[PDB]
């Protein structure tokens, strides 16, 4: 629970009430990631289902099993498309977990994805100009 998330939401709300739209650059990132993930799963369904078939999460799955599958996804280098697939992969694991009435695994998967991004992907993201570069390239 972030105090900064709470501050930014309250100020944004209070500004919109007076007619002012405080631009949050991460809002554009979130929207582009949603759309790119939708497009990846629909237009490249064979690539998407090939990734989701490699892991099914149970309460006994350790992070290292998720890390090994994702490491194989990035085996030939990081690019923004593989990063989209990584988000779609995690979302498919969460949908599956909820399907199987194991909703607690959603928060676990979300923590694994953040760990992987911060340990494996964040230097590359910084070198390539941060998430704003993703937005500019996707539209």
């Amino acid at each position: 629970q972030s105090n900064r998330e709470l501050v930014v939401d309250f100020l944004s709300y209070k500004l919109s009430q007076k007619g002012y739209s405080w631009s949050q650059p991460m809002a554009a990132v979130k929207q582009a990631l949603r759309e790119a993930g939708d497009e990846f799963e629909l237009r490249y369904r064979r690539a998407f289902s090939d990734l989701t078939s490699q892991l099914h999460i149970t309460p006994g799955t350790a992070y290292q099993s998720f890390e090994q599958v994702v490491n194989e996804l990035f085996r030939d280098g990081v690019n923004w498309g593989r990063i989209v697939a990584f988000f779609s992969f995690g979302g498919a694991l969460c949908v599956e977990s909820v399907d199987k009435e194991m909703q607690v695994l959603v928060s676990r998967i979300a923590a694994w994805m953040a760990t992987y991004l911060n340990d494996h992907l964040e230097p590359w993201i910084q070198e390539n100009g941060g998430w704003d570069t993703f937005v500019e390239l996707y539209g």
């Binding site: 498309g81 989209v84 390239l137 996707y138």
Partner: peptide, 13 residues
């Protein structure tokens, strides 16, 4: 995108 799609393996926004 076309540039990301071209990094798929041939077997496979």
């Amino acid at each position: 995108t076309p540039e990301w799609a071209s990094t798929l393996r041939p077997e496979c926004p």
